[PDB]
Amino acid sequence: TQLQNNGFVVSGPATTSGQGNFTSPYIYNDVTNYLRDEKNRPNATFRDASSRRLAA
Amino acid sequence: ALSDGFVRLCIDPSLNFFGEGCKILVEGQITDDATAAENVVTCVNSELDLVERFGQGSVLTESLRKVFCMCKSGVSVYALPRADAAAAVSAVYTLTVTGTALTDGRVQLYMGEAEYSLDIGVDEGDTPTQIAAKIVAAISPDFPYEATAAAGVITLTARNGGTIGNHLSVIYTNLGSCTSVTPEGVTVAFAQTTPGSVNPEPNDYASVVNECCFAVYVLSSDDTDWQENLRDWIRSAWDCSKPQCFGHGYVFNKGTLGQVLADGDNSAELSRLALPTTYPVLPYLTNAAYGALSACSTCENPELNVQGQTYGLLSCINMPESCTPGWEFTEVTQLQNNGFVVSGPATTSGQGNFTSPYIYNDVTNYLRDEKNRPNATFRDASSRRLAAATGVALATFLQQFNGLAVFTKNTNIKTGIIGTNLRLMLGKIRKWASDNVGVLFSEFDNINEDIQLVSDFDVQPKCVGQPGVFHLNMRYRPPVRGARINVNLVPALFDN
Amino acid sequence: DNINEDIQLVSDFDVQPKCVGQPGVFHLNMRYRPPVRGARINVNLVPALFDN
Amino acid sequence: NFETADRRKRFWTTQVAACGQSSDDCGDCARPGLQLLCNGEGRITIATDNYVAGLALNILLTDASKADTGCGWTPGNRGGFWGDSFRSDNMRSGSKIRQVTARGSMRETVALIRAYAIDDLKKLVAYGVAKSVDVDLTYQGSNKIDMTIMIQGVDGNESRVGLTGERIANAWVWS
Amino acid sequence: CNKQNGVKNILITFTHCDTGEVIGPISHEQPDDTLPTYKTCAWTNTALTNGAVMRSASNATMTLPVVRDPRVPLAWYQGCAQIDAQVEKFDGTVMTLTEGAVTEPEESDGRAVTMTIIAAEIDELLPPGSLAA
């Protein structure tokens, strides 16, 4: 929770058990490291990575 | 797949087991001989691995043997061995043989469980007690008690320390009037000499079962403090502070009526099994049998009640019937009204002939409620299973709205756009809930009021909500169990 | 896989620059796959001692 | 006498992964065969577990007699087994799941493959080994296909009373 | 705005039968002034003598005239694919349908398509403040 609220990407595995087999991880949230603003006023305009792509 | 063949080439499932999805965890003591590491969940394969992996005649091995005997396939098993306390004391029992055999006969015992019975023939008349007590050479190794075969008396010492070794009552066939293979002039006396002292109190479930889902927890112990810790862990798995790992636990309580009722700490996460003080079967075996039967070996259908003589029959357990029911009917009713589970014989022959037990009511230990109002919302174990099933099913259904455009201010969707608004979302969910009637819900009292959808912009104050967050509130009732009907019988003498 | 994208027709006046193409010449672009002659399937086998 | 009266024994049985698994870039697959069990002083012996699973493998991994075509086949590989002319149950050995042909879209071909699989494993009920069998096949895409086969068994000793059907004969294999 | 009889949104989801392909819910627009019609009671009465009736199975149907989307083949709108539809009127009513099928399709010029759909059950969401449960 702390990492996500601070602009970070957290990945986790698709399955959980003690069998010790192989699994593939997946991304929880696609978020850039954007926080605050040019004037140091918080917002979430560029929180989503898709926002940068749309702006271009 | 070479030098031959055609379309449809084969590749096979190297492993023959695929019934994964439901798991059972068994926790209990072990002995020194066990090679398994303590406080580490491990997968159990079959009966061959036992003994070596968990010691000879250990509490864990006996519980596991019954679990495999009830669930032949369709469920995966797990074990969590635990070590004895630092200063545990092992119980001691004495069984003295007196008199000199003077007629040819046979002596046979019944201790703890039918699997441990024995039958040895007295050699010949005029064999004193010293030549007798050969019973020790016949006692099966798996018996949790060690026989020493002293001079004229045989001593039984528990192989595991703690209070787990304070439960016995022997049924016996000498001094009886059955001269069918009985040696005349031989008698046996049964008494106890030393009780158990100390039980372990592990409190590290968060570390060894961290974020691992288990359908049923089975605990082979009678320590109230140990059971209390297990209940707390289950609450956390059902908590609202994080993704949930739904589960259920099975425990047993033994003693007089006054003692048993004192353990009812209103736990909806446990199904406490009540037994009398003179149960002729070792306690933890029956608890394991009940847990295994209900550990999705039968309950792949969440709404199936494990009761009656057809579904709640613990066939793996055999025991002779005592001269008294054990639980007087006035006491059976009280236990069922206080959230306990009561079991009894499945056939009516109360003589000493072998029978099997079955379960009357599949009821958890739930009473009262948050605040202090009384209700029966989670009275039946099936309710807990159905509640978990509904959550998973509903979560899967809502996945289709993940990443879908949502319009909230202007509700007219343009031509060609792929999106939805609140009303359309509510209608689709309302359709799903109504469709499942008869599978997960009963008839809704008022379907128009029991479902609501509100966007986060309508809950938070101005300029505080987030875009694309909803609050769904639903209320439901599980399928109805039964009904009461008043019958007024009235014969008539007048002809019209 | 997608018949709407695997066939394209373009006149030579759209490939060459101004006043360089020829009248009555086309370019046909196509992609195809021959018939399949194989298949693989998993045969997970579960002999289950009965429990309804 | 002792209640263990059933004297019928069990012979060798083919087992999955008996000879290990053959690995390849596409994936890993088992190599079924016979299993050897060793004692503490040599004296090897053949395993005899999972009778029904062994029977299922034999039925699936064997080419049955091929249908007439009008052009013919070479005498070497007409299919079938020469020992089927002595049995009296009026059936033929093997399976015909490898004789399908690419017809229509892949969805149609897969559906046909399932039909043949059911039509072959149905022989298990006829012999009496199992009381029911069903195969579930799921199509997910071009290269990923799965098929699960469910076989129902019974306990060695009758326990329930009032069955609509019948107690399958040859149940002494209890599976 | 609560007494205006009209249609506000129309969403349709197609599921091709020969390829299992699914196309998300696409908004649609109606071709003319006519409105869709509904029948939600899946039992039909016939008149016997002296006030008695006689039930029969029947189905629940919907007539949905919509304008073809220029990005979807014309075959899908006819009886060559499954349909899931939702219609939201101005007053607030919402009518949902799933696993519907098209019956007896007629020729269409290429833009205006009239679909007759039949389903096991049609659900309705009345505006807030209903009476029946």
XYZ file of C-alpha atoms in Angstrom, chain B residues 404 411-421 423-424 426-428 430-431 434 445-448, chain E residues 8-9 11 25-27 29 69 71 86 88 92 94 96 98 121 123-127 130 132-133:
48
model
C -14.158 -0.165 -19.280
C -24.968 9.799 -19.588
C -25.596 9.769 -23.363
C -23.046 7.384 -24.870
C -22.024 8.440 -28.365
C -22.440 6.147 -31.357
C -19.678 3.560 -31.633
C -18.328 4.117 -28.120
C -17.745 1.135 -25.827
C -18.788 2.097 -22.317
C -21.489 2.056 -19.674
C -23.149 4.177 -16.990
C -27.884 2.412 -14.373
C -26.702 -0.084 -16.989
C -26.821 -1.925 -11.874
C -29.202 -3.614 -14.300
C -26.603 -6.186 -15.326
C -29.432 -7.203 -10.785
C -29.860 -9.743 -13.588
C -31.819 -12.867 -9.750
C -37.578 -10.288 0.064
C -37.335 -7.087 -2.013
C -34.850 -7.272 -4.883
C -35.372 -3.571 -5.644
C -31.613 6.869 -24.526
C -28.955 4.147 -24.882
C -25.808 -1.505 -26.162
C -20.784 -3.549 -25.914
C -21.186 -1.025 -28.733
C -23.638 1.855 -28.536
C -28.651 4.587 -32.761
C -22.645 -0.313 -37.259
C -17.570 -1.822 -38.524
C -29.710 -3.423 -23.162
C -32.412 2.472 -21.362
C -35.172 5.470 -16.151
C -33.715 -0.515 -18.170
C -31.678 -6.417 -20.200
C -28.818 -12.288 -22.581
C -36.291 -14.451 -19.507
C -35.305 -8.599 -16.741
C -36.622 -5.115 -15.999
C -35.382 -2.329 -13.715
C -38.142 0.111 -12.813
C -37.240 3.636 -11.663
C -41.429 0.665 -7.215
C -43.982 -4.830 -6.406
C -41.117 -6.856 -4.960
